[model samples]
Target chain A: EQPEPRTRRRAYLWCKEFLPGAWRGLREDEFHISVIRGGLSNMLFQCSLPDTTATLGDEPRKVLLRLYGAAEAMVLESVMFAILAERSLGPKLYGIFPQGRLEQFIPSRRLDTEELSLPDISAEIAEKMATFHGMKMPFNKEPKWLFGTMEKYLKEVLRIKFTEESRIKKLHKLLSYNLPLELENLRSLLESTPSPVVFCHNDCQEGNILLLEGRENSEKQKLMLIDFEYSSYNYRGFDIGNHFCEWMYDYSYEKYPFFRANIRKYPTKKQQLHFISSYLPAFQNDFENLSTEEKSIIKEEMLLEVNRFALASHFLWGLWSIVQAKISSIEFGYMDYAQARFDAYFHQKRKLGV
Target chain B: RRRAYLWCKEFLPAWMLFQCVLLRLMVLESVMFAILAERSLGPKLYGIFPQGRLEQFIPSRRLDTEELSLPDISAEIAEKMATFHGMKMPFNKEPKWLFGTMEKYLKEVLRIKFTEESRIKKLHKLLSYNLPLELENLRSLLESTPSPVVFCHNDCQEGNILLLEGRENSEKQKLMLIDFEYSSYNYRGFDIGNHFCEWMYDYSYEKYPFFRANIRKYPTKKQQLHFISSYLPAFQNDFENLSTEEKSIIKEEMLLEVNRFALASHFLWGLWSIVQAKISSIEFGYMDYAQARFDAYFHQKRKLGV
Candidate 1:
């Protein structure tokens, strides 16, 4: 647990107010605060009581403190968290407020980039994706959040000036994306494309997923999806396709760019067949009993759906990273990351002959 | 008071399909349940749907007509009935409540030939009995003895009351009042009186209309006082404070008022069974049940001189 530099006492004061009963008779210095290294958009603190502190039966010994980097997302994210928690789809929320919130600090590790590509692991991810998309959440049903956001971020993409030629070249490739035009083409092309509109975990990369190992037992949940700021109603393929897209990018690298895209590591036809076959059965009433011809027909269409709808994921995150590069100081190579995703967008765009 | 904070309505509310098909009563009834459920007075309402309301289970047994005569059972029914009468629902406060509605139902019943067979056509012809005039006479007769106006469980037969598990130390926590479809603000005496009338009917019959009523099974003078005396202490805050003789006077008068309201119960349900006999496909001699109710009315009316 690495102590936060300037806000050591600051976190203790805030944590005490959020969980008063759990903090009784305990001093500020008695708290052990550790930084959680995951999504850089928000600051995550793993707040724990001292090991010697006696705890009550159901009271929290360790909880997570997630501070909203910029404030207003609280209203939407707080509601989504509570609902997912109620359904056991996400971590339990202990307390929520305007600036920050407390959540269950489950002992787990992020799925390693290579772990996501393994056969059994990847199939479970597909099944879990199917499980999540099946939910009908209390939100706007229109699938406008992604395309609308891309247009919004395109405005930011046009405004920023990068520092050097190294950053400058990356911006040139990002600017050439013509995001508005590419978004319009995808929208036009996908109109005739048949994929069910569904609730999607718009960011389904490896780091956003966790692997929890439990005491030997029959019924314990092992994998979990977290960081829901971008989840919403969208085409089903975008979630599936975006997850496949994550296979190429490894974010565990500790270097100048902080991530590497080995494009050759993109899922193969053999790998994708395993993933899609695992994913599509939830939508069918009797998939196991389907005739051979019927199952093959469905597989062809779904394969078409996922590969094509991936255009949305490319444009969405590329535009998303461009905006973050301009407004954020997260130390990741946003401009470089944007170029790499659009590079995939162009390669796939031509390879599909569309 | 058990609280069911969360429940969902789609748990095979197939019976509720008839309750709504039988207001469009099933839907609006579910809405009322959701209100009482939050206060821990009724079962928890889960989610309401097109066909039925899913409600929390009470883990109890339905009381039989014989069980209703028990002293402990009489006291438990009194406390819960007292609480039910104290409830304030979003309904109008009008004196024309029961009689006017019955009169209107009679006019509606007279319009349809009631899709009947030969057996029911006998009572069907009895609809010729000037219902509006009969309602006026029944209303005027009950006007002699004034009864307190409160929410009454218009139907408090043994069928509507459930005794929760663990009868010991559960006396105070024993029962629940369900099937509030007929609930409204009316004479408190009607509920007490109607419950007494119900003692004559046994619902365990599987034959037709699925029940049997006997005038001889009705509560005697001593049994009526035991229930009346128990009822008042819960209904009135001042009952327990009064002198023993004053308590006797009050219980005696309530006994007379309750029996008078029994005449209303006879006419109200007598006409209701007739209508239900016509439209309801869930068969049980609705006409046979109606005949007994109307037959009891004349006997009670002639005996009471009302």
Candidate 2:
């Protein structure tokens, strides 16, 4: 795709200035630019030197150029991204600007829905999530940030004029169910069974997970988590719950003006237990040495905790979509997405009798 | 979709939006054709994603072919392509539907007037006056001959053929045919002739306008003999074992047929490049390419005494 010339020139100039060693002895036309699809929130590109004799033996010097979208959390996203990059958990930071940033290009594919459901892949993702949550991020410990952001978005949604009056009325009707009450009840339930609060990748969806091919003669793949735009310090269970909730929807199919959301594909309880078993060992190494009976008890306990947090996950994205429905220039059905998340939130909340 | 997106950026007018739709439809149509062709023929289709499918971008190293020449594998590729054309037609469509579309495009789009005297206008001035007559002659000539119609990759150029390594067997074929945007049910002669015409042009390098200085006058008689011998089903197993009489007869028949059909290939791509000059976002000089095709067509037509 033909990217905006201004962005292209800016990225080129920044790369030239910051990466003088790699950019040395290369013409402007020598660099090949290819658009990397599948990113909904930003325009991503892969810029690399051509594979000619002049650049044969050197490591393929390529960098990713991410053009920012019309999102409000750029500062927070950049901060978290820098932290993750410093810890070698995310892609390396090449350079940063007010508009966007240049990142190390990882040669990998986004995990599909079926691939994500595989036991080994599920366990691997759980391990990565646990590792991320264990990091010492300099953020507030209180969960007020989560609710505060939702309130901010709620106010933004109220100010916008929607094309359909019925959609606005339906949104208001859903909001009337006292979302604050559900949040308070969730907070109280979680407080009783207190867990350590660490930095969490609040959005741990499959799209954010990338799979790189293993080394020679090995079938195992390396999984890398990306897009820390929604990451924050929150409940450990919220990360796992949000990831589980993400298993239900496949945003790959386009029906024109909307993405096809297959809500029927939510993970089973057995699958959640399998994922949690992988996650529990990161916090308590001795837990792995426990008997099957003991492990089963722990699995059931974590299941209850994650199930309650799953409601918060849905609640978070539900309000997030309400704001996105009005602001996002992306061609997704944000109104429908908001409705779906809210419906799931209410369904799960009622099941828990909260 | 990326190509269409690029074109959309260039033309955002409400009226020009239809061109974007048409461009996208063309891409989808190519994918559908590839699916059908794979079922009918035995070639393994290297994945086809229309728009939304998460396509894998395999960063493969280009095979070193600096000293490797095209002629070394031309016969093998010709045989494989002949086998492809020999397959049964997947759909029941008339050849006129294919040729008729080209005729309409030639007249309606390519022949339309332009204010400035650009290369496209000059090329149009030269070909537009005689293209109608040439097309009419081609249509009547093919109709009277009544050659067997099979599924033809109407645009079988080198660019559409990819050489993929890493197969399990070293001796097995590594060449694959791709980009079925113009593939349809047509005369077998057209596919072979189009491929022969492709040998004379190299669009890979940016310096030239795709007229190979040496072989631009069409394939030599000996080159035709080698290509046709390999293309025929009888000699596919052993191309070098052709008898004198068999080679002579096969060469005469193939030459007579391919020469006639070569005109069709030239006019087809010539008209295509003219339309692309107006609509495409690619940086290549489409108008110059069109001029080159018309020049080649006229040069070959004069040699044939048509």
Please name the candidate that would achieve the greatest lDDT relative to the true structure.
Answer: 1
Clashing pairs in 1: B7-B46, B8-B46, B8-B47, B9-B47, B9-B54, B208-B285, B209-B284, B209-B285
Q: Model 2: per-residue lDDT, tens digit, A1-354?
A: 755666567656656544434454566666667777434457788877667725433333888878775422543465456556656888876565565677888888888866777888898888888888777543344555566776677667657677788667767776776766666776677667544566788878878888875522223347889988777667777888889888876678668435455555667887887788788897677888999999888788788778877877787787788777776667777777777787787777777785
The complex in candidate 2 yields a DockQ of 0.01
User: What DockQ results do all the predictions give, each relative to the true complex?
Assistant: 0.02, 0.01
Please give each candidate's TM-score: 0.54, 0.50
Which window of ten consecutive residues has the lowest lDDT sum in model 2 chain A?
A212-221
lDDT of 1: 0.75
Quote the lDDT for A236 in model 1: 91
In order, the Cα lDDT scores of the candidates are: 0.75, 0.65
